[PDB]
Amino acid sequence: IYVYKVLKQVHPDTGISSKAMSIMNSFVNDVFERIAGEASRLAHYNKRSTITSREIQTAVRLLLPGELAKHAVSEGTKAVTKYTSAK
Amino acid sequence: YAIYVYKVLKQVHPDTGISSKAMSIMNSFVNDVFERIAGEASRLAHYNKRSTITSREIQTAVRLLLPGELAKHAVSEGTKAVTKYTSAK
Amino acid sequence: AKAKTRSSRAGLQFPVGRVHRLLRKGNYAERVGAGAPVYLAAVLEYLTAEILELAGNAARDNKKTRIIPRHLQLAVRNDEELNKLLGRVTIAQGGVLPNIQSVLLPKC
Amino acid sequence: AKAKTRSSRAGLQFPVGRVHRLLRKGNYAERVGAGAPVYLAAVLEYLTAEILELAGNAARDNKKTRIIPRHLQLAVRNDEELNKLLGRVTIAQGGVLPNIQSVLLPKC
Amino acid sequence: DNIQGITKPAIRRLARRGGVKRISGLIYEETRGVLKVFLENVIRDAVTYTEHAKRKTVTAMDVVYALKRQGRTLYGFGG
Amino acid sequence: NIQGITKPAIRRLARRGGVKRISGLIYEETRGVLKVFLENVIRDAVTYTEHAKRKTVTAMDVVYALKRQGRTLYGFGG
Amino acid sequence: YRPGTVALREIRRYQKSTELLIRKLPFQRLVREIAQDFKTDLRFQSSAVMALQEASEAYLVGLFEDTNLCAIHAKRVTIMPKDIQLARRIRGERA
Amino acid sequence: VALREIRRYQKSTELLIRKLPFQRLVREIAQDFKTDLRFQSSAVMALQEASEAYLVGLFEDTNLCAIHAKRVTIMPKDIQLARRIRGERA
DNA sequence: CAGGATGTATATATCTGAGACGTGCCTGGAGACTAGGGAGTAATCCCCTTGGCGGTTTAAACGCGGGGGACAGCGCGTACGTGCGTTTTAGCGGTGCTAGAGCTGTCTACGACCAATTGAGCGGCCTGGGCACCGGGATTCTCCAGCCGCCGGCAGC
DNA sequence: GCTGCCGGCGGCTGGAGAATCCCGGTGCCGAGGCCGCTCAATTGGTCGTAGACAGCTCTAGCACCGCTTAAACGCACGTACGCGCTGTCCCCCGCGTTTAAACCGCCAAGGGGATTACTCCCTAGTCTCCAGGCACGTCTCAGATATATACATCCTG
């Protein structure tokens, strides 16, 4: 559902196939693991016990190369402030 | 892991020592290997939808990473060690 | 009453609660904060939106309505920043980028 | 009653308790068994013993009484299987195996 | 006597996809050799995964899992 | 500071590599590769140090950075 | 046609397509034969068969463009085995 | 004498680049990411020797490629080819 | 050095029909609504180790200059990979067919969790003496360039 | 024919710079005893994952033949390989020298790290109802064929 809505929000007149969506699902799952394990290792590196936005931000800067990283950080910041502004 | 390794030398080479740099290097070695084995074992324990890490997971891990002769020597000593552990409580 | 989902308040199209459950049950850390799943959902939405938009533009350039993995490969391999991220990844029925070394063509 | 270490009962010179503690606060799994720390200690002990014997052989070859990371490099790189196991690992003060390509040598 | 089932035009087609202009005759066996080393490397992990799972059928999950373990992860198979 | 890599330094490095003859154009190419590899480690090194709110680049952070890149280091802790 | 013209035509023809190059049945037989050496009396899923198939295709395609680079560096147009083992050695699998 | 040096450095282990110029280069390249940075000493030699290992591996790969090219001299095209094959430049 | 005939590619008209897209049903998990108690957070102080300074001195880089051989270019022998025709031989498949291995639900039981005591393993901190470091000098160890006896053409007859 | 003659040819001789060994003195610093504390072994109990049994059942390998399409064998041939001659000009390799790293010593202090009172944030516990997965069910516009023209070659004059 969510990938379909993402497609509709950018291309409302473009469809997708079946296997080409399983590819997207595998990609998202792989990136989720690659970021979550990284954030967990940063959390354990400083002898910490909680995972917050700072560790995930550092993992994003580490993983995403350059321009994608700086684009991601801004959107994540606005996304976290709209959450904190109105719970 | 300094003292255990020193006992290892004294049980292998009673007349050979070890430098401090070698000590730190092989300490990092054992830490790296432990982390690799534990990570693979935890990965398998989650991968087969279980919640307890047992000797079977460690056995699969050692059979999985160490290539060749090390694999069967390691599994042989693992089984013999756990058997003498359980036989003599 | 008046239940409200976290995705709506976060302005996202992603199941933030599902990501929070995955983090809790994934054995990454003993305790998990609050904004980490929101940030993860946001970055995932960004990257998947960029990927899907590139694939859609490639499909439109190929004069085809739906999206196939061939267009996925053409869109992924044509962006070096994306290429480095997906350098060690192969896609089912993706094909290769059509290229020829300049030497083996005839003289003129 | 009189207490005794787990390693003595297990006939090992590696710390069963320390390995168990590392597994427990290692975040790896919620619960662990009893034979897993013993197995891990045994395999670590075997690997350390074999690597230290391989270093000691070279140390006595070079007529020295203590191990130098250079000897560790020789022991690791002179065993092809161990080189495969330790291919990407770089050793401090290890140098490189001596090697000269055949053509670079003179005619006779 | 089955590895020879990888016919010569198949290798020629594969190399033309690679983009070669001329093809020798001595590469047809070295390509087969690298092929079998690839496959036995993958299927040893694939079989040991099932053995740990103590089943008798090898699914796509085990093979893709082992492929990703070597650092050659592949999408499109329910990863 | 890039020129601090003197010509005999790369010469002896290549001799350790196992080369016999050296032309006159490897020198700046080597310096560029050296600089690129340096920045590729300083980036995540300063990232790690900034994450910990510290101002000193400890050896632990750089060995972690080398491990992340895929080339582990032995001797400096672990 | 002049020699190599058909080669160019096939190069431009086949790099655009994406379908497989090896017949399914021989590859299945090869995989089954190899699987006997590790554990006999097994059962295979077709999904795994095509996964192995496409992985093999990707690696061989990789090795072929590396061989092409070796051949062009060798001031040649043909491809020779020294190139294929050079490409295997530089990458480091056979190190 | 070139082969004599080949015999000479292949047995030793110490670093082959002066410490202070390397430290100056590291500080010069690190000032751009952040200003007023302090470097621990051991990290400097760790980075130095890691770079030495990387570079000597690159040299050995390039020499192997050059001897494959039926030549005794190494040229930048060999280095670019080796980088392309190893999968680093592209 | 400019045209012609050609096997190629390109476009374009119906077929034509498995399955993205709704459309509902139903269910289980995520939000709404209660403390708590322990993980982090400033605030503090107390080391510490690091950037910095300024004489020697001392091994190392560098521009110069001479030299010799590795390499790119060009030419020629030559042999084997390619374009193409003729079998022929194996893959696709479509049809059933069979039991085997995979999946899930229930009942039980035993082993990891955790709390409270009690004892020793070892990390630290001196400490004496033990094994590498360095110097010179004698001992070999190869590397080179010329002398020389021998040899196979080379002008004559 | 047969005299010299001439240049190489390798075989040998010996001088040449290089690498190695051990003695002899001098340190620097892994290895060992001590103290105590801090965490690890022992008891004692629980309650819930994990193993068994017991079913259901979806599914993968067999076989079977009709068709056919790509694979194997052969065959002129010309192009791309491999080798040999060659003309340098571009690195190597000592030398004077000019220079910058390394030691060596003494400081200040901004930053790293251990303690401490606390507070307030995610976890622990239930209820509830609504978003999402599954079973269909279509009618599509998504494909697929088969048709018809331009094109870039290799020959000709």
Side-chain angles (χ1 to χ4, degrees), chain A residues 1-86, chain B residues 1-88, chain C residues 1 3-108, chain D, chain E, chain F, chain G, chain H:
Chain A
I1 323 183
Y2 322 104
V3 166
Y4 290 154
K5 310 147 54 173
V6 166
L7 271 193
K8 299 328 192 263
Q9 96 182 58
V10 292
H11 279 166
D13 62 319
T14 295
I16 214 173
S17 35
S18 196
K19 142 191 293 213
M21 161 55 168
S22 46
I23 296 172
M24 269 326 135
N25 173 325
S26 171
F27 176 121
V28 152
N29 190 340
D30 161 8
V31 152
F32 168 53
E33 200 45 89
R34 203 192 298 199
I35 287 194
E38 191 56 57
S40 158
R41 97 197 292 151
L42 277 292
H44 181 258
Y45 271 9
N46 314 340
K47 300 216 49 41
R48 195 61 142 180
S49 42
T50 38
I51 289 194
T52 38
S53 210
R54 31 186 316 273
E55 307 85 339
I56 275 183
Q57 202 285 334
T58 50
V60 194
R61 304 193 251 131
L62 265 166
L63 222 36
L64 301 203
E67 214 283 337
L68 331 172
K70 34 191 76 40
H71 271 170
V73 309
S74 62
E75 80 72 38
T77 43
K78 64 182 71 43
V80 71
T81 88
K82 39 175 81 42
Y83 185 11
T84 65
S85 66
Chain B
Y1 294 80
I3 315 177
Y4 318 107
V5 164
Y6 208 85
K7 309 187 278 286
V8 155
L9 289 320
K10 286 333 192 174
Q11 289 208 31
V12 175
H13 286 11
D15 56 13
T16 315
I18 179 168
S19 155
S20 325
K21 307 153 86 43
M23 201 31 254
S24 85
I25 273 171
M26 158 254 269
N27 200 63
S28 168
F29 180 99
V30 57
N31 270 343
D32 182 18
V33 152
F34 154 67
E35 157 284 339
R36 225 190 266 207
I37 275 178
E40 281 288 3
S42 174
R43 196 131 63 76
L44 289 205
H46 143 86
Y47 255 79
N48 65 350
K49 314 344 158 195
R50 313 315 289 202
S51 65
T52 281
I53 290 206
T54 190
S55 71
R56 162 178 197 80
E57 316 268 29
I58 317 298
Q59 213 151 19
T60 60
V62 47
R63 198 179 324 287
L64 198 185
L65 291 63
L66 304 319
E69 70 303 347
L70 327 184
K72 332 153 281 297
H73 331 87
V75 297
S76 65
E77 45 216 337
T79 88
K80 68 194 213 64
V82 305
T83 36
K84 46 181 194 35
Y85 175 37
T86 174
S87 50
Chain C
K4 181 179 197 313
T5 172
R6 260 184 279 185
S7 154
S8 62
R9 80 197 53 170
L12 276 191
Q13 284 84 359
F14 225 112
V16 315
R18 187 183 290 181
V19 167
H20 182 27
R21 206 198 58 234
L22 288 198
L23 264 296
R24 284 208 320 289
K25 217 65 53 183
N27 237 348
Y28 299 100
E30 262 176 24
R31 328 183 66 264
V32 162
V38 202
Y39 196 5
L40 203 40
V43 56
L44 282 183
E45 174 149 298
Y46 174 43
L47 50 74
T48 195
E50 178 276 333
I51 289 296
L52 270 43
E53 161 270 0
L54 245 185
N57 311 295
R60 170 218 295 164
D61 294 325
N62 297 33
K63 327 156 278 289
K64 146 165 180 46
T65 282
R66 313 189 151 185
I67 270 179
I68 55 186
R70 172 85 177 135
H71 299 132
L72 192 158
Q73 201 69 346
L74 269 293
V76 165
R77 300 317 185 192
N78 252 9
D79 169 301
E80 314 58 19
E81 199 142 294
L82 241 194
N83 191 353
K84 190 271 280 173
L85 172 43
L86 290 192
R88 216 64 45 76
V89 173
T90 176
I91 320 296
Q93 293 275 71
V96 308
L97 204 44
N99 76 85
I100 293 186
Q101 273 90 30
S102 178
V103 47
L104 58 100
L105 302 322
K107 314 172 48 191
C108 202
Chain D
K2 166 142 192 304
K4 53 178 155 317
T5 180
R6 262 191 262 191
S7 322
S8 62
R9 325 211 289 190
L12 288 190
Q13 68 184 291
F14 253 86
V16 174
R18 176 162 321 168
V19 161
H20 198 298
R21 186 157 51 70
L22 280 201
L23 268 283
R24 283 330 282 170
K25 264 43 50 189
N27 162 92
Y28 309 120
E30 301 56 20
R31 310 168 63 197
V32 299
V38 175
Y39 199 107
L40 184 53
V43 54
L44 289 193
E45 176 163 311
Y46 147 79
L47 273 169
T48 37
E50 79 86 39
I51 208 53
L52 261 63
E53 170 75 70
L54 265 173
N57 77 23
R60 95 192 39 70
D61 199 347
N62 301 57
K63 316 155 282 303
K64 324 179 53 49
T65 165
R66 88 203 55 63
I67 312 189
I68 166 63
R70 175 56 174 189
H71 290 353
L72 283 174
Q73 169 81 12
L74 280 301
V76 155
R77 200 43 83 80
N78 266 312
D79 180 7
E80 164 295 339
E81 189 275 343
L82 268 189
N83 169 43
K84 180 146 190 263
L85 178 50
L86 273 296
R88 317 316 73 202
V89 183
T90 88
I91 272 298
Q93 276 299 77
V96 65
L97 264 192
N99 191 342
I100 274 189
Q101 190 275 339
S102 70
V103 165
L104 310 183
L105 283 181
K107 62 175 194 300
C108 313
Chain E
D1 168 44
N2 161 280
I3 183 76
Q4 315 68 329
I6 304 313
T7 67
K8 164 197 159 175
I11 289 295
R12 296 181 59 83
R13 293 194 291 259
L14 290 171
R16 289 289 209 274
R17 167 75 66 73
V20 300
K21 284 272 301 303
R22 225 152 176 263
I23 300 201
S24 279
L26 185 33
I27 44 189
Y28 294 120
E29 54 272 61
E30 330 190 348
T31 36
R32 288 196 189 81
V34 312
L35 225 36
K36 65 222 172 193
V37 62
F38 196 7
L39 299 310
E40 55 63 46
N41 275 296
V42 199
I43 319 147
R44 74 141 61 91
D45 300 38
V47 174
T48 189
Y49 263 103
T50 322
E51 158 285 350
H52 168 50
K54 60 190 171 302
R55 342 166 293 192
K56 294 168 201 167
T57 324
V58 174
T59 81
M61 201 46 38
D62 319 324
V63 53
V64 69
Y65 268 18
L67 202 43
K68 151 291 295 181
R69 195 228 52 64
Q70 164 183 170
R72 294 179 197 279
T73 183
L74 153 77
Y75 289 169
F77 292 76
Chain F
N1 297 301
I2 179 59
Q3 284 288 3
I5 302 315
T6 194
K7 203 190 142 326
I10 171 180
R11 198 74 194 213
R12 74 220 281 181
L13 263 203
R15 291 295 187 233
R16 179 180 279 211
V19 78
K20 172 164 173 234
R21 296 211 23 184
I22 288 304
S23 160
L25 305 172
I26 317 86
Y27 294 119
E28 88 315 325
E29 154 37 68
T30 325
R31 293 141 177 220
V33 159
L34 183 46
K35 183 97 74 171
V36 162
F37 198 21
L38 265 288
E39 37 209 283
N40 275 4
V41 189
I42 318 314
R43 58 140 295 199
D44 35 18
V46 307
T47 291
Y48 264 94
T49 39
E50 161 271 350
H51 165 90
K53 311 278 203 63
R54 263 182 276 106
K55 212 83 54 72
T56 52
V57 192
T58 325
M60 248 314 324
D61 310 86
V62 47
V63 47
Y64 274 169
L66 264 307
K67 155 171 293 303
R68 178 46 150 168
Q69 195 280 317
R71 260 72 155 266
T72 75
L73 257 283
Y74 279 10
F76 303 81
Chain G
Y1 293 112
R2 299 296 311 277
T5 311
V6 202
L8 214 67
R9 291 218 290 237
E10 149 155 37
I11 279 180
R12 294 294 49 169
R13 183 206 170 213
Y14 199 141
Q15 262 189 8
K16 165 173 42 54
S17 69
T18 201
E19 85 298 344
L20 304 182
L21 278 294
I22 301 194
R23 330 290 275 271
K24 285 317 298 177
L25 165 144
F27 198 88
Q28 165 167 178
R29 293 158 29 209
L30 174 55
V31 167
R32 291 175 184 283
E33 146 174 346
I34 287 184
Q36 301 151 341
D37 305 13
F38 219 82
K39 189 19 68 171
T40 86
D41 311 66
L42 269 190
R43 194 160 289 277
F44 264 136
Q45 183 43 242
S46 57
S47 321
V49 197
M50 320 77 58
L52 293 214
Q53 214 286 335
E54 181 175 10
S56 53
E57 305 298 349
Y59 206 4
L60 62 86
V61 163
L63 266 282
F64 303 171
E65 61 311 351
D66 311 319
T67 311
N68 224 317
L69 320 170
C70 306
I72 39 185
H73 184 228
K75 314 315 176 293
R76 273 206 317 286
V77 284
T78 85
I79 53 186
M80 261 175 208
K82 43 173 144 160
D83 319 299
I84 188 45
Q85 310 95 34
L86 161 80
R88 294 211 71 230
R89 178 47 192 112
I90 289 189
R91 271 192 179 178
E93 302 67 346
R94 216 185 64 182
Chain H
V1 281
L3 271 299
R4 197 114 55 82
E5 322 183 359
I6 287 177
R7 307 299 308 115
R8 149 55 198 102
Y9 313 81
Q10 277 199 10
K11 307 313 161 294
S12 62
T13 73
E14 70 313 351
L15 298 325
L16 317 94
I17 286 193
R18 304 326 194 274
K19 316 315 168 197
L20 269 309
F22 188 79
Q23 180 42 35
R24 275 166 28 226
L25 178 58
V26 156
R27 272 190 208 270
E28 187 260 356
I29 196 150
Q31 53 64 20
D32 84 348
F33 299 4
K34 190 181 314 306
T35 179
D36 160 359
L37 284 173
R38 336 196 92 192
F39 277 117
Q40 270 192 219
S41 74
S42 79
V44 182
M45 41 223 71
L47 259 191
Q48 191 185 357
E49 68 143 35
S51 209
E52 300 294 347
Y54 193 80
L55 255 287
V56 69
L58 202 173
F59 303 141
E60 79 151 11
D61 275 357
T62 43
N63 154 46
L64 171 146
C65 166
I67 61 130
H68 165 270
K70 68 177 311 295
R71 291 172 320 180
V72 83
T73 54
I74 69 180
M75 324 197 206
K77 53 172 165 163
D78 314 313
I79 324 165
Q80 310 153 230
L81 163 56
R83 284 308 288 301
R84 174 62 199 74
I85 296 184
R86 298 160 54 72
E88 294 335 329
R89 195 75 60 90

